[PDB]
Design an enzyme around this catalytic site. Structure first.
Site, PDB file in Angstrom:
ATOM      1  N   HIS A  21       3.787   7.330  43.633  1.00 51.68           N
ATOM      2  CA  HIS A  21       4.135   8.572  42.969  1.00 51.68           C
ATOM      3  C   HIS A  21       2.923   9.482  42.982  1.00 51.68           C
ATOM      4  CE1 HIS A  21       8.081   7.558  41.142  1.00 51.68           C
ATOM      5  NE2 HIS A  21       7.646   6.343  41.414  1.00 51.68           N
ATOM      6  N   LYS A  76      13.041   6.581  33.272  1.00 49.94           N
ATOM      7  CA  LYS A  76      14.225   5.771  33.485  1.00 49.94           C
ATOM      8  C   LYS A  76      14.960   5.435  32.204  1.00 49.94           C
ATOM      9  CE  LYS A  76      11.484   3.480  35.869  1.00 49.94           C
ATOM     10  NZ  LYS A  76      10.789   2.319  36.452  1.00 49.94           N
ATOM     11  N   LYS A 123       2.801   1.353  43.921  1.00 45.05           N
ATOM     12  CA  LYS A 123       3.828   0.360  43.665  1.00 45.05           C
ATOM     13  C   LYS A 123       3.330  -0.983  44.167  1.00 45.05           C
ATOM     14  CE  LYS A 123       8.380  -1.229  44.740  1.00 45.05           C
ATOM     15  NZ  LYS A 123       8.556  -1.545  43.306  1.00 45.05           N
ATOM     16  N   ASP A 127      24.997 -15.491  17.629  1.00 43.50           N
ATOM     17  CA  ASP A 127      26.100 -15.799  18.525  1.00 43.50           C
ATOM     18  C   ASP A 127      26.358 -14.658  19.483  1.00 43.50           C
ATOM     19  OD1 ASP A 127      27.604 -17.990  19.204  1.00 43.50           O
ATOM     20  OD2 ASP A 127      29.449 -17.201  18.316  1.00 43.50           O
ATOM     21  N   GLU A 182      24.668 -21.674  18.659  1.00 45.52           N
ATOM     22  CA  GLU A 182      25.843 -22.319  19.215  1.00 45.52           C
ATOM     23  C   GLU A 182      25.431 -23.598  19.923  1.00 45.52           C
ATOM     24  OE1 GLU A 182      28.502 -19.697  21.201  1.00 45.52           O
ATOM     25  OE2 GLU A 182      29.136 -21.216  22.644  1.00 45.52           O
ATOM     26  N   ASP A 189      32.165  -9.547  16.331  1.00 45.65           N
ATOM     27  CA  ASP A 189      31.087 -10.404  16.793  1.00 45.65           C
ATOM     28  C   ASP A 189      30.143 -10.795  15.684  1.00 45.65           C
ATOM     29  OD1 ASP A 189      32.003  -9.988  19.466  1.00 45.65           O
ATOM     30  OD2 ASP A 189      30.913  -8.089  19.461  1.00 45.65           O
TER      31      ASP A 189
END
Ligand SMILES: [Mg+2]
Ligand SMILES: [Mg+2]
Lengths: 114, 1206, 115
Positions: B746, B755, B772, B819, B912, B1159
């Site tokens: 960049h 982003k 990068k 959960d 769970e 939920d």
RNA sequence: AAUUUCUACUAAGUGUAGAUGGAAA
């Protein structure tokens, strides 16, 4: 035997100059007003390889505001300040500050100019 | 004191910090001029060569020692196998004889013919040089003199090969379970058909070519299995069966080919032999991967031939023994019942009805524990014949014919795909792009490998694991074809690991700097042998490595106050005192230290260890010998500040060694003049790497990493012994993996987009370049220092019991409950000791908090984007590893949000339990990633620590909590772990929490008899006019399988609206729907109980639609799958006040007192089960707490959920 | 002769492609990620004038980061998300979904995609 | 879209927030 070949060169060189001015419009849009380079604005497509700087017609001033046209997408330029009402379609940056043009500044040196 | 403050310093726990080493000053030029890399790059590039050579030598050794083995128990095993065991407690001695057999094959292995100079340093030094006749192959193994320590893991894995641990990676298990099995099998298969092959056509030839001594009968006769253990042995056995080559182009026909051509009878179906097994892709270049694909799947390669053979073999599914082909019970029956019969659960239900008519009595209803035992007995069943599966269906529908149809359909699928892929199999194909970016070439590979692999995964069910009489005429050909088809797994796993592989690479090698023991430890005295120290200047920590020939180059350096002084870290820790002190004091040094016989004779007996009750004077006698000898042995008296405790504190021997180890850690600071070490660098006598990572650089201001905090605390003054520097550092080098023709950047001062859509500032204008993967485009040295947190632990005790004792005696224990969900990646609700909900929210928005401002990174819209991205990518191979590397970089930012609540509340956690649950295929965080979460939440709670806390305070980096045991294995996640209660998750989300209702009926339509019996099984169906509702008074005693419930007398209503799924979606209103249904058929629904009126209509169009609305009444889980904004759970049953539970009446509240979404209900009812377990702990006595069960069964759970709310 | 012009007009086509990509890369670099147009990508120059949309070897996905190479400044793009490492040098924005490509989007529309 | 390394980033400008047990097979 050269009916249209000249009309091919005249389009290739103009497309190259347009790519150059589009690569330069950004590098100009991202600078502080007091660090712009000295342009040789002509409102006619100018080359950066030679430019024929010996001609007494090419001026030398710092560029102003670089405005993106609204009808088409041409990157037009202003010179000095908005109080000159000067508006150009083609420029080239040179290190010939006042009116004597020693050399044409390359792209990597108008980027580094910041 | 909170429940947590008791849990610290419990057990030892070792981690491995990493760092980047930046060569400082003129050390890079010196490493380049002395050439200390291309040597160590050549070594760890040819190390695979010496691995090849050592494998060659191991194979030669094995084949040289198995020409002297003798299985004496064989003459009795051969007869014990064919006994028709009928175990009756007689096969246990069979197991014992088999074990003794495989052991007496490893006696020579483990004991004799070497095996000593095999895994030590000797083999690459002296043994292997002999075992070679080339100079090339000798130059390699000669270069590794002294670097044997670069193998020890390889030698570790090569001991698994000589032991008999009953594993696929052993020799005995190979030559016992996979040879003797097939040996006796083929021997009897011959005994059947011995007199078929006449003499003058097979015998006269197979005599002269193979051996011409003990020709053809002896290899089947008797105990000649003591000859088919080598490689030439099994080669001659397959030469008996498969045939020879006679070193030219003859290829005489083998026994299996003779049985094949003996189909002259055209009714042969004869059982063909089986070979013996024997012990001992690409990912390099695009052209190689394409060549391997073409060579392993084109229409000439063996895989396509095997697909053809399976198509043929399953085209003749009629002419085989329909009582000898065995489908395997397990996951495959669930789908075989959908293909063959037409429903998902036909086979299981037919088998359950039969087991009912056998084991169950004629009780009016099932019992929960009985139904569980029935499920268990089903799970124990091994396989199913095609005959049984024929019995479970009605007439006019075969089972063999339906399977033949299904398999032919799948094979036509494979052929169609192979047709749509002919462009790639041409030998004159070429590529326009690289395979990693090419997709019309990878899409074809995937569309072909998925077809072949989803054929191979549907065929495997025809094995059934070891049975009664089977159909050898089927299984011979089947196994011969399937064992070839199985290589598509290798191909599909070694082409996907090349199309997914990232562009860079982390492939490194180890630097030794011309020294075997480089950096193997940091000791003061041994510096001249290890050559590695850790200087420190200001707040920057430098490695320092001397050289080969100047080992004395960091001693003659004094402080001298030149305004520059490197510190220097020294005073070696103590190595293993429990063996060191006995070794360092009983190494035959009793000559001229002391005079006494009393100590020497109790040494002779060795009566200072255990093996007796206990003694006060004998143990402390040796303790005082060691004490008054170390306090006079100068090598340790001056080094360590041995401030032992008093005499009455000792009660055992282990306390003494733990104290000696706790006291022998004195990392200390010496000084050194900066100009002298800098000149040493410049003279080429000292390589000074700087340890570094982006939290050491001066331009960093925020919170440092965790490992940076550990590495800084390694040298603090308030770190007494908690985090110590366990020796054994390493230094690796990584070459650059990116060409500098491929960096993308960049550019400077060009506004970039952000982003994160929830970020206010929507641009960024940085005044530099943001490359990068800048780190992968440069040679990078990395450094691995291991540390050992809580080396000498004081508060030793079992945790599974201390958490229980701490919960029992606590009055108000909170419980976090976690959960998954459909509209929430992970919902959290934390409920206090009574049942109140004190906090509940979703983990979808991870709110990152820095410098007083907080920005909320969503992690659901992001995963939704990556799923929409995968949907339209045409290759789904690197676009479904991105989601799998996001969902596992999301459950590392949830782990902090859990270790924040565990400290804010002193709570236990209720997760769970994944071994006993089936989440419905639309929940976001699938099981494979959850198991990665429950394993990432244990490894964090092992040493829970808060970065932003004072490093000494309880909770901070030096005294962090240890509230869970180490992670053992994914199957050891059950019923308890530290603070992490694993609770099952049945009847958890579809259970209204205002009352405790649950839907235990079966409201699908079958017929008119069942429907009339249903509408007659209620007690009242009456239209109350004051409430405009259809009251259904039901009693759960009349219906079936409702033995779980507790109240058993419910007053259902028709309140609210529901969301029929129809995948369409339609919002229906129940009262209005019932009015329309009853008007459409003329039913006067104003006569109170209309039960008898409802049983009058006689069409199939009524009870097919009444059951629909009756089902929509008992739903409580309305979803739309289109908006996260409208999902809600509603209950059809009034509570003690009179109002229904409508989860839309709590979404518009700041802190409700009941679950808001559907939920939060899942996690609320997962936490309530753990509240019930805590309830159980408040009954037993502290000696029985280790025995209270936690697996709350459905009856207990419904009782607790229906009694608590009153 | 007349087969040298047709070896030089194919060098005006490329100086048109480069200009088009440079005009685009400064009109994609500004839109926020949830509005970047659906593009047809390729590693060999794509003429946005004709493009023969019927060709079956060009898909249509979103366009992620628009970076800029290191040695030269050729504007590479990034289809989908970065972590796919699907770097393509020449794109052209279309208006179709994944494979039923409808028509080539004109630069005025890509510009008015930001509003 | 920079990192001991992974994920999400740009987080106030060569970085921010969590996590991270490596070597080996
Ligand atoms: Mg940080
Ligand atoms: Mg990234």
């Amino acid at each position: 035997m050269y009916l249209v070949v000249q009309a091919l060169i005249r389009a290739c060189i103009i497309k190259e100059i347009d790519l150059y001015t589009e690569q330069l419009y950004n590098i100009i849009k991202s600078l502080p007003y007091d660090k712009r380079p000295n342009v040789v604005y002509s409102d006619q497509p100018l080359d950066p390889n030679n430019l024929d700087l010996s001609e007494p017609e090419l001026w030398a001033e710092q560029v102003g505001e670089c405005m993106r046209y609204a009808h088409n997408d041409q990157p037009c330029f202003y010179i000095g300040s908005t109080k000159r009402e000067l508006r150009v379609n083609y420029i080239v940056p040179v290190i010939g500050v006042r009116d004597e043009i020693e050399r044409v500044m390359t792209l990597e040196e108008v980027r580094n100019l910041h | 004191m909170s429940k947590l403050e008791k849990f610290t310093n419990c057990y030892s726990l070792s981690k491995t910090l990493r760092f980047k080493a930046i060569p400082v000053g003129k050390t890079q030029e010196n490493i380049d001029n002395k050439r200390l890399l291309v040597e160590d790059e050549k070594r760890a590039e040819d190390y695979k060569g010496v691995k090849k050579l050592l494998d060659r030598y191991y194979l030669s050794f094995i084949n040289d020692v198995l020409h002297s083995i003798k299985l004496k128990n064989l003459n009795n095993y051969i007869s014990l196998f064919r006994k028709k065991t009928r175990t009756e407690k007689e096969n246990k001695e069979l197991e014992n004889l088999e074990i003794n057999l495989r052991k007496e094959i490893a006696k020579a292995f483990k004991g004799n013919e070497g095996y000593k100079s095999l895994f030590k340093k000797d083999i690459i030094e002296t043994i292997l040089p002999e075992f070679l006749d080339d100079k090339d192959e000798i130059a390699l193994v000669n270069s590794f003199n002294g670097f044997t320590t670069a193998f020890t893991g390889f030698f570790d894995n090569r001991e698994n090969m000589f032991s008999e641990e009953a594993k696929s990676t052993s020799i005995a298990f190979r030559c016992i379970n996979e040879n003797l099995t097939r040996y006796i099998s083929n021997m009897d298969i011959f005994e059947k058909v011995d007199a078929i092959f006449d003499k003058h056509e097979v015998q006269e030839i197979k005599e002269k070519i193979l051996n011409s001594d003990y020709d053809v009968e002896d290899f089947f006769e008797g105990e000649f299995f003591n000859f088919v253990l080598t490689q030439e042995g099994i080669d001659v056995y397959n030469a008996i069966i498969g045939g020879f080559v006679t070193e030219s182009g003859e290829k005489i026909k083998g026994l299996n080919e003779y049985i094949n051509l003996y189909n002259q009878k055209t009714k042969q179906k004869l059982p063909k032999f089986k070979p013996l097994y024997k012990q001992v892709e690409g990912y390099t270049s695009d052209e190689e991967v394409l060549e391997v694909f073409r060579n392993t799947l084109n229409k000439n390669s063996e895989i396509f031939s095997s697909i053809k053979k399976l198509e043929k073999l399953f085209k003749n599914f009629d002419e085989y023994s329909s009582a000898g082909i065995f489908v395997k019970n397990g996951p495959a029956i669930s789908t075989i019942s959908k293909d063959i019969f037409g429903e998902w659960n036909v086979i299981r239900d037919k088998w359950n009805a039969e087991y009912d008519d056998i084991h169950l009595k004629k009780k009016a209803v099932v019992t929960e524990k009985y139904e569980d035992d029935r499920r268990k007995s089903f799970k124990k069943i091994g396989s199913f014949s095609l005959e049984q599966l024929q019995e479970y269906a009605d007439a006019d529908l075969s089972v063999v014919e339906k399977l033949k149809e299904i398999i032919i359909q799948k094979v036509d699928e494979i052929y169609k795909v192979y047709g749509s892929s002919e462009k790639l199999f041409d030998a004159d194909f070429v590529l326009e792009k690289s395979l990693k970016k090419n997709d019309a070439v990878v899409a074809i590979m995937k569309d072909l490998l998925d077809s072949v692999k989803s054929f191979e995964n549907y065929i495997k069910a025809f094995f059934g694991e070891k049975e009664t009489n089977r159909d050898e005429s089927f299984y011979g050909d089947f196994v011969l074809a399937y064992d070839i088809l199985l290589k598509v797994d290798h191909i599909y796993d070694a082409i996907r690991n090349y199309v997914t592989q990232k562009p860079y690479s982390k492939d490194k090698f180890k630097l030794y700097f011309q020294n075997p023991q480089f950096m193997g430890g940091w000791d003061k005295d041994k510096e001249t042998d290890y050559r590695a120290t850790i200087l420190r200047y200001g707040s920057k920590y430098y490695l320092a490595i001397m050289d080969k020939k100047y080992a004395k180059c960091l001693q003659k350096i004094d402080k001298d106050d030149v305004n520059g002084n490197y510190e220097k870290i020294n005073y070696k820790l103590l190595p293993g005192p429990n063996k060191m002190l006995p070794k360092v004091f009983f190494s035959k040094k009793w000559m001229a230290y002391y005079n006494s016989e009393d100590i020497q004779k109790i040494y002779k007996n060795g009566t200072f260890k255990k093996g007796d009750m206990f003694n006060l004077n004998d143990c402390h006698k040796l303790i005082d010998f060691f004490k008054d000898s170390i306090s006079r042995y100068p090598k340790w008296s001056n080094a360590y500040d041995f401030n032992f405790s008093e005499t009455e504190k000792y009660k055992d021997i282990a306390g003494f060694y733990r104290e000696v180890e706790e006291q022998g850690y004195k990392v200390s600071f010496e000084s050194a003049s900066k100009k002298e070490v800098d000149k040493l660098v410049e003279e080429g006598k000292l390589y000074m790497f700087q340890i570094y990572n982006k939290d050491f650089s001066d331009k960093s201001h925020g919170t440092p990493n965790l490992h940076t905090m550990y590495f800084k605390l390694l040298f603090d003054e308030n770190n007494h012994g908690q985090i110590r520097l366990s020796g054994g550092a390493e230094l690796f080098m990584r070459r650059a993996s990116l060409k500098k023709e491929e960096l993308v950047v960049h550019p400077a001062n060009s506004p970039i987009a952000n982003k994160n859509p929830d970020n206010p500032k929507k641009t960024t204008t940085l005044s530099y370049d943001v490359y990068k993967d800048k780190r992968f485009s440069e040679d990078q040295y990395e450094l691995h220092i291991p540390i050992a947190i809580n080396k000498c632990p004081k508060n030793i005790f079992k945790i599974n019991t201390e958490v229980r004792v701490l919960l029992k005696h606590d009055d108000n224990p909170y419980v976090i409950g976690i959960d998954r969900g459909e509209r929430n990646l992970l919902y959290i609700v934390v409920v206090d000791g009574k049942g109140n909900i004190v906090e509940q929210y979703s983990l979808n928005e991870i709110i990152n908090n820095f410098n007083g401002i907080r920005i909320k990174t969503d992690y659901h819209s992001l995963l939704d984007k990556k799923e929409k991205e995968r949907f339209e990518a045409r290759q789904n191979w690197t676009s479904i590893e991105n989601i799998k590397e996001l969902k596992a970089g999301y459950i590392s930012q949830v782990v902090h949000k859990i270790c924040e609540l565990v400290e804010k509340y002193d709570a236990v956690i209720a997760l769970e339990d994944l071994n006993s649950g089936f989440k419905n295929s639309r929940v976001k965080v699938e099981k494979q990633v959850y198991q990665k979460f429950e394993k990432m939440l244990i490894d964090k709670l092992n040493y829970m620590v808060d970065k932003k806390s004072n490093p000494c305070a309880t909770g901070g980096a030096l005294k962090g909590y240890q509230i869970t045991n180490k992670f053992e294995s994914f199957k050891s996640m059950s019923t308890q772990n530290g603070f992490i209660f694993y609770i099952p998750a049945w009847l958890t989300s579809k259970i209204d929490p205002s009352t405790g209702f649950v839907n235990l009926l079966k409201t699908k339509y079958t017929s008119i008899a069942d429907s009339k019996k249903f509408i007659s099984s209620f007690d009242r169906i009456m239209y109350v006019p004051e409430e405009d509702l259809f009251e259904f008074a039901l009693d759960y005693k009349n219906f079936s399988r409702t033995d779980a419930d507790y109240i058993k007398k419910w007053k259902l209503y028709s309140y609210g609206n529901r969301i029929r799924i129809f995948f369409d979606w339609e919002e229906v209103c129940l009262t209005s729907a019932y009015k329309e249904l009853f008007n459409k058929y003329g039913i006067n629904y104003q006569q109170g109980d209309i039960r008898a009126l409802l049983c009058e209509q006689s069409d199939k169009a009524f009870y097919s639609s009444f059951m629909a609305l009756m089902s929509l009444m008992l739903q409580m889980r309305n979803s739309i799958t289109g908006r996260t904004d409208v999902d809600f759970l509603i209950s059809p049953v009034k509570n003690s006040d009179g109002i229904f539970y409508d989860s839309r009446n709590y979404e518009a509240q700041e802190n409700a007192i009941l679950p808001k979404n559907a939920d939060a209900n899942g996690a609320y009812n997962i936490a309530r089960k753990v509240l019930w377990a805590i309830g159980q702990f408040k009954k037993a006595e502290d000696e029985k707490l280790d025995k209270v069960k936690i697996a709350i069964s459905n009856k207990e759970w419904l009782e607790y959920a229906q009694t608590s709310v009153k």
